[PDB]
Structure 1
Amino acid sequence: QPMEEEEVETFAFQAEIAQLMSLIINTFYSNKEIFLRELISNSSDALDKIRYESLTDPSKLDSGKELHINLIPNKQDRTLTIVDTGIGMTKADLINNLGTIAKSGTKAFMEALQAGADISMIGQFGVGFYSAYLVAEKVTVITKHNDDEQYAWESSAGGSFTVRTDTGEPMGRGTKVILHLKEDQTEYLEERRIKEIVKKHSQFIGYPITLFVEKEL
């Protein structure tokens, strides 16, 4: 009878990760724009990985040979999406690497901030993904790894995230980070803003970065 039915799992964030997310989403910072640099850096790393694999196994690219990053503002949905065709994440990858396992860099980073370091350094501690919450009230991550199903990860912070199978629109391979922006952060939906931040901070990314301005007609 139902059109669709999907099992949804809810996981608690590891304690230090939950602390970091609260610090990030609540604290005032003057340089929030660095979130885009961090997410693009993540995409680049994921692209480096699938590329490495394809060096010895070309069939790794059967799911798509183009290695690139797309930025997609949607003013109607108030979302900014960063899409890449990197190696993507398995379900275990999602759960392990985006929430439940703390890396040493998590506590280290919060220690660094209290010691006077800047939020812009977050990427050096290996947790730059969470800078997304500088500007987003909710983040949705859609991801597809070779040989695996497509999954959707989601969290509005507050201590937990969900995982479920995603059947919406099939990706060949890679990861899509959908930022549901805070009301006062909608500037990052504007073309001039996206362009100047990419020019300023992502100068040396070795993959094509393309803007797609989305409007439902």
Structure 2
Amino acid sequence: EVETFAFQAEIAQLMSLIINTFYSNKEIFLRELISNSSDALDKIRYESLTDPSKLDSGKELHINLIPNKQDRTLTIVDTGIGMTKADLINNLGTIASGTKAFMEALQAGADISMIGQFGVGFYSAYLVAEKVTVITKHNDDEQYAWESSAGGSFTVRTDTGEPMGRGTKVILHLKEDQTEYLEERRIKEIVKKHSQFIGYPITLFVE
């Protein structure tokens, strides 16, 4: 039922740097996740141009932000292109993106806020999350769950959870000390500051 993979060496090093570097400006993780969702939405919008039945799995292109204070989770959901199983394993840990360029940049005076220039911004989720779960559904495949609490490994399984139409869900199990990012005022503040021109509706769920 569950396959366990080692991250490629430089991805493991990147995650360790993100988890262990003292760096207080953590709110930047949201912008990076929201940009990755916007890109995934662009991709399905593009393909649906030449093949309209690609949206049989849902026409609405949007991003939802779902805080849950009981579970201590912040969930970013899109109806983007999604990923196949092979896409998931290839893009989320078995390959290196500006992974090397980012880590060399940090030693030449870049700072962690610049991670998105390097195409590895997804890993800034580890500034605020002790565990990340990615649930994804591509038109070409079944629904899969990737998961990692860092420490060098991740898992992939077929997802038995709620069948989504198509897209990706990023579930952040936040660290004990990072529950500010479940607060409605805080989330609105961050989206307004960093993601205010994203070209899809961003809906902040209430509790």
Into which bin does the TM-score normalised by the smaller protein fall?
A: over 0.9
Listed one character per residue, the Cα deviations across residues 93-114 of structure 1 (whole Å, up to 9, x for unaligned) are 0000000011x51011011111
**Counterpart Cα distance in 2 of 1:124 and 1:22:** 19
Aligned residues: 206
**Counterpart Cα distance in 2 of 1:9 and 1:41:** 28
Identity %: 100
Describe the SS at the equivalent of 1:62: helix
Higher mean C-alpha deviation, range 114-123 or range 151-160: 114-123
**Counterpart Cα distance in 2 of 1:176 and 1:70:** 9
Residue 203 (structure 1) shift:
1.2
Listed one character per residue, the Cα deviations across residues 67-106 of structure 1 (whole Å, up to 9, x for unaligned) are 000000000000000000000000000000000011x510
Mapping for residues 115-194 of structure 1, pairs under 5 Å: 115-194=108-187
Listed one character per residue, the Cα deviations across residues 32-70 of structure 1 (whole Å, up to 9, x for unaligned) are 000000000000000000000001111000000000000
Describe the SS at the equivalent of 1:206: coil
**Counterpart Cα distance in 2 of 1:28 and 1:137:** 16
**Counterpart Cα distance in 2 of 1:169 and 1:119:** 35
Listed one character per residue, the Cα deviations across residues 122-164 of structure 1 (whole Å, up to 9, x for unaligned) are 1110000000000001000000000310000000000000000
**Counterpart Cα distance in 2 of 1:147 and 1:42:** 20
**Counterpart Cα distance in 1 of 2:24 and 2:149:** 22
**Counterpart Cα distance in 2 of 1:55 and 1:164:** 32
Describe the SS at the equivalent of 2:135: strand
**Counterpart Cα distance in 2 of 1:185 and 1:27:** 16
Describe the SS at the equivalent of 1:54: helix
Residue 24 (structure 2) aligns with: 30
**Counterpart Cα distance in 1 of 2:86 and 2:24:** 35
Describe the SS at the equivalent of 2:22: coil
Residue 172 (structure 1) shift:
0.2
Describe the SS at the equivalent of 2:57: coil
**Counterpart Cα distance in 2 of 1:52 and 1:90:** 18
Residue 30 (structure 1) shift:
1.8
Listed one character per residue, the Cα deviations across residues 10-47 of structure 1 (whole Å, up to 9, x for unaligned) are 00000000000011012221210000000000000000
Residue 9 (structure 1) shift:
0.2
**Counterpart Cα distance in 2 of 1:38 and 1:164:** 25
Describe the SS at the equivalent of 1:29: coil
**Counterpart Cα distance in 2 of 1:184 and 1:27:** 16
**Counterpart Cα distance in 2 of 1:137 and 1:164:** 20
Q: Which runs of 4+ in 1 moved over 4 A?
A: none
Q: Structure 2: which 5+ runs fail to align?
A: none
Residue 167 (structure 1) shift:
1.6
Q: Structure 1: which 5+ runs fail to align?
A: 1-6
**Counterpart Cα distance in 1 of 2:82 and 2:31:** 19
Given the two structures, how large is their TM-score scaled by the length of structure 2? 0.98
Alignment counterpart, residue 99 of structure 1, candidates 93, 102, 109: 93
